[PDB]
């Protein structure tokens, strides 16, 4: 006995020693890296906002205006779903499954992954 | 609680945005060109990642060092990249990632030889207009929420024209006034 | 006016040749780059970092150049030595695809180290071609009867010696070596660089399995090693990697 | 012998030919000494945006 | 001090002639109407710059927009072009078309438009085509909106025919073109023409 | 005045006065014309006034 | 004086009327004029 | 081989007329102005 | 008989959304085994079922530790005797149906280190007449 909670807890806590070890390195200390060939500072790419969405237009308040107004807005699809992504599954898998309320699930699943644009 | 992270994803938006500095120079054929999409330019230019014939290639690696490239060539826009710069940093082949690159620089998205001094501006678009772009949230500064559709504008700016959207002044002109 | 051109600057080989970086190719707010921080929209406030402000000043001036079913990845090794300094370096290579000379990207890689030799376009191609010469019937195997071997994989970068040990199947082909060279990076937190030298040195390992299944034909799978929880049943892993400072 | 891509083709060029028709309205005799050319009219586009190109030539 | 040496000869971009060999490639609608145009510009202006025995690489490139026409004469016995697409096809092809006529009176860019075996087949439809309309057949009865669509397209095809009618001198029994051209000669009413 | 004025396209009276002085001065070269304003008035902004 | 302007700058703005304006240039008789205008001459033989 | 030359003097009048007889009259003062000043090259 | 001591003593309690109503933590079925067949259509001698229900259980088991930290790749292969051909399959696998990688701390799940991204950056065009604006 007591082998395969020894295990469980070694790998939990060396987990947590690599969470523990890249954070300090990447964002606490000195906030990213250096390139050593080019000057471009490392960074991860999960705090990158890796997709774009398409354009939005709209008009000024005052008439014969000449001022141009370039800005950034973020969206998402109400910031409390993962994205668990079920989208890169074909049609054909899931048809032998013994419930339906799993099939409305999957379903919803992969429309709120295909509308991830406004 | 709802608007505290919101200010708090507003504040570490505004934390890590990587503002510019240097504007970009594109030529006026490459404005098929998206960063999101694959163009079926490049699918028909490179047939060996669509084709499937190689398992080392294919389009997501050929995305990743699609936007490497040209993510950093644009943050250091002044320095002539190259190819030994990028190789040591990417694992792909030789005789591919020169085709890239030579088809990167071939139309004129990287390494454009221009002296932007000697060339007069004009007013393309329309003047009024809010262009705003639409980023997602990215996975790892959202919130906790131990257990939300409120949009967040993180740089205000404006334009009095195109003359000094082409130099990147912000109107601060009334502080450095001559 | 008051534009900053687009090209015209290639300071790159006194950053190879600045001593500080980690660049194993030659021998002889608190930020240090503004990628997070505005400069309020001002040219001239991008002169207060050093690393930005040397290459403003010892920048230079060069000119524009201008230029299969199945896959063969060979890692191709270099190590010339050359007025004082070595070259020191590995890159893949397809050898079903011949659409670039080795010659061609020789010439390439001394223009980017700016020596214009005429001599090391030749010294580095030979060195190419005669390790496709050796490695060409090496790499296209057909690798069936499950082997399931042990691998020792070490990484040589700067005293920073990298160290792994994991069992491989070398008989499916799902699982790509250069994700699987990714995914320890974005594990342990890496710097790019050993992106390509985890893969550049698991697929040496590869073809010496290879050389050890074509030219000898020793099977040897005969109880690969684990910890009676996986494969074999023993009582019911083999090693962890680390980057070690030497 | 068509009903269908005939009145589409007849709504297409019929407000074409008007918009060509419609393209030479303000350069009139007691329509350009007036200042109802110049000022305010953004909504215009085809002058008062090649200021800037035409100073670059000399042709003032 | 690096900003003191800088090559004029390319400092102001990429020159014009890889600009416009680009623009063509290019998807955008506005650059291939300028570089078209530019093309006409300059067919007219400086016909040896342009010339297929300089640039091999140039022949493909003005395919791409005269081959997709014969859909477009197919459809040309009836209101079929509705939207502004198809009538800037018509324009681009009947653009291009001339470009290649005016690039076909130099006596060194002709014969590898006669060693090339689809241009001369573009031309034997415009020719067959234009039979019905020498002759009197009930088949492809040309719309009297789009007539002016054909006859100055039909030139441009005559003028090539009389460019590479010098280099087709072994004539068979079987000739399209010699039966094709006895019957235009018999109903048109234009002086350059016959 | 010589202190800096409000935001720009407003046109004081000291700013349309300045530039009806200039052009009796020179009559052209609009580099000379601009300055004449202040110097905070674009050659492609007083023109587009002036007209 | 600005009456001066005012001709050089509509006759420099309307004199081509045809290059910028999009529905002028995309007309059937505007684009084979400007088609057939830069017709190079035939040679004899 | 690339060589960077002078493109050709292309006669781009500001006024676009349509008619034959109103162009010969400015390229013939175009060819006088053009060949006079590449005379003396030669 | 060995799974029972561990899931009683320091086991978080259970977060399971909608979508995964699906899998049975004492036996497989139809979708399991449809997705992988190399565990069970004589692939080899080493991808045996039993070893097979070993990794699935103990994935799902070493995930109940710590509910709000990513599982990684490397610790689950730490102790495991397992290919890493078949650990990515079977990670991947529990990381697509949502499993193990669900509701945790988005600020756990680590990404490629690279440069920033280039999407709201002012690109202008090099008009041969001009420097209009790209604003579409």
Redesign the interface.
């Known amino acids: 006995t007591n082998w395969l909670y020894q295990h469980s807890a070694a790998c939990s806590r060396f987990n947590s020693d690599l969470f523990y070890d890249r954070v300090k390195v990447l964002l606490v200390d000195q906030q990213g890296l250096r390139d050593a060939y080019t000057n471009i500072l490392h960074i991860p790419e999960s705090t990158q906002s890796t997709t774009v969405l398409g354009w939005r237009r709209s008009k000024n308040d005052s008439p014969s205006d000449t001022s141009i107004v370039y800005e950034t807005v973020i969206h998402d699809n109400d910031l409390n779903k993962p994205k668990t992504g079920l989208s890169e599954i074909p049609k054909e898998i899931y048809e032998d499954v013994v419930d339906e309320d799993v099939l409305r699930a999957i379903t919803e699943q992969q429309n709120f992954e295909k509308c991830n644009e406004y | 609680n709802y608007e505290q992270e919101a200010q708090k994803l507003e504040e570490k938006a505004l934390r890590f945005l990587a503002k510019q500095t240097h504007p970009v120079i594109i030529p006026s054929f490459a404005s098929w060109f998206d960063i999101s999409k694959i163009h079926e330019i490049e699918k028909r230019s490179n047939p060996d990642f669509f084709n499937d014939s190689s398992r080392f290639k294919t389009p997501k690696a050929y995305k990743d060092t699609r936007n490497f490239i040209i993510n950093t060539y644009r943050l250091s826009p002044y320095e002539y990249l190259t190819i030994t710069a990028v190789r040591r940093n990417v694992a792909m082949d030789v005789a591919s990632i020169v085709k890239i690159h030579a088809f990167l620089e071939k139309w004129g998205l990287i390494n454009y030889q221009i002296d932007p001094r000697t060339k007069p501006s004009l007013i393309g678009p329309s003047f009024t207009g809010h262009f705003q772009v639409v980023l997602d949230t990215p996975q790892g500064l959202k919130p906790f929420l131990p257990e939300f559709p409120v949009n967040l504008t993180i740089k205000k700016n404006v334009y009095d024209s195109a003359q000094d959207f082409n130099a990147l002044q912000d109107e601060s002109r009334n502080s450095r006034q001559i | 006016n008051q534009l900053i051109p687009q090209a015209y600057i290639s300071n790159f080989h006194n950053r190879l040749t600045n001593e500080d970086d980690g660049i194993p190719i030659f021998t002889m707010g608190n930020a240090v780059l503004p990628d997070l921080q505005d400069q309020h929209h001002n040219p001239f406030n991008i002169l207060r970092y050093p690393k930005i402000r040397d290459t403003f000043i010892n920048g230079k001036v060069v000119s524009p150049y201008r230029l299969s079913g199945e896959a063969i990845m060979i890692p191709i090794t270099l190590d010339i030595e050359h007025m004082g300094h070595t070259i020191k370096d590995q890159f893949l290579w397809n050898y079903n695809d011949d659409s670039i000379s080795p010659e061609e990207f020789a010439s390439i890689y001394c223009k980017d180290l700016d020596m214009t030799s005429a001599t090391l376009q030749t010294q580095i191609a030979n060195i190419i071609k005669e390790q496709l010469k050796d490695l060409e019937n090496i790499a296209a195997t057909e690798i069936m009867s499950d082997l399931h071997v042990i691998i020792n994989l070490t990484c040589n970068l700067q005293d920073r010696f990298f160290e792994d040990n994991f069992q491989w199947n070398l008989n499916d082909k799902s699982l790509t070596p250069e994700r699987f060279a990714t995914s320890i990076v974005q594990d342990l937190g890496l710097t790019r660089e050993f992106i390509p030298l985890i893969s550049q040195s698991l697929h040496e390992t590869i073809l010496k399995i290879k050389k050890d299944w074509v030219d000898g034909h020793l099977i040897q799978d005969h109880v690969p090693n684990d910890a009676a929880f996986g494969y074999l049943s023993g009582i019911r892993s083999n090693w962890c990697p680390r980057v070690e400072i030497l | 012998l068509h009903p269908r891509e005939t009145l589409t083709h007849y709504l297409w060029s019929s407000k074409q030919n008007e918009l060509v028709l419609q393209g030479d309205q303000y350069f009139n005799e007691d329509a350009a000494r007036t200042s109802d050319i110049y000022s305010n009219n953004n909504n215009d586009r085809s002058l008062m945006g090649n200021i800037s190109l035409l100073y670059s030539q000399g042709r003032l | 001090?690096?900003?003191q040496?800088?090559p004029k000869?390319?400092?102001?971009?990429?020159?014009?002639l890889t600009?416009m060999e680009?623009?063509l490639?290019?998807?955008?609608p506005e650059?291939i109407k300028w570089s078209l145009?530019k093309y006409?510009?300059?067919?007219?202006?400086?016909?040896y710059?342009i010339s297929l025995r300089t640039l091999p690489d140039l022949l493909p490139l003005f395919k791409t927009f005269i081959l997709p026409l014969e859909r477009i004469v197919e459809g040309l016995n009836?209101?079929?072009?509705?939207?502004?697409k198809a009538?800037?096809s018509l324009?681009m092809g009947?653009?291009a078309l001339?470009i290649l006529r005016?690039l076909a009176?130099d006596t060194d860019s002709v014969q590898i438009l006669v060693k090339d075996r689809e241009i001369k087949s573009f031309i034997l439809f415009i020719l067959k085509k234009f039979q019905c309309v020498a002759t009197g057949d009930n088949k492809w009865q040309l719309y009297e909106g789009n007539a002016?669509?054909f006859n100055?397209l039909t030139h441009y095809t005559l003028?090539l025919m009389?460019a590479i009618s010098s280099y087709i001198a072994p004539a068979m029994k079987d000739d399209h073109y010699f039966q094709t051209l006895v019957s235009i000669l018999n109903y048109t009413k234009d002086r350059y023409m016959v | 005045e010589n202190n800096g004025n409000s935001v720009k396209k407003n046109w004081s009276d000291q700013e349309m006065l300045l530039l009806l002085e200039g052009i009796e001065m020179y009559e052209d070269q609009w580099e000379k014309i601009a300055d004449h304003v202040g110097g905070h008035k674009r050659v492609e902004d007083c023109i587009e006034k002036f007209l | 004086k600005q009456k001066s302007i005012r001709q050089k700058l509509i006759n420099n703005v309307a004199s081509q009327a045809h290059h910028n304006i999009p529905y002028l240039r995309d007309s059937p008789f505007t684009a084979a004029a400007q088609r057939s205008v830069q017709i190079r001459s035939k040679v004899i033989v | 081989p690339l060589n960077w030359v002078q493109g050709p003097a292309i006669f781009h009048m500001l006024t676009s007329p349509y008619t034959q007889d109103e162009i010969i009259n400015h390229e013939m003062n175009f060819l006088k102005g053009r060949l006079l000043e590449l005379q003396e090259i030669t």
């Open positions: 001090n690096v900003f040496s800088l000869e390319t400092a102001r971009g990429v020159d014009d600009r680009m623009a490639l290019s998807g955008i650059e145009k006409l510009t300059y067919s007219n202006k400086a016909p710059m009836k209101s079929s072009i509705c939207d502004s009538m800037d324009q009947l653009n001339l005016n009176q002016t669509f100055e003028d009389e």
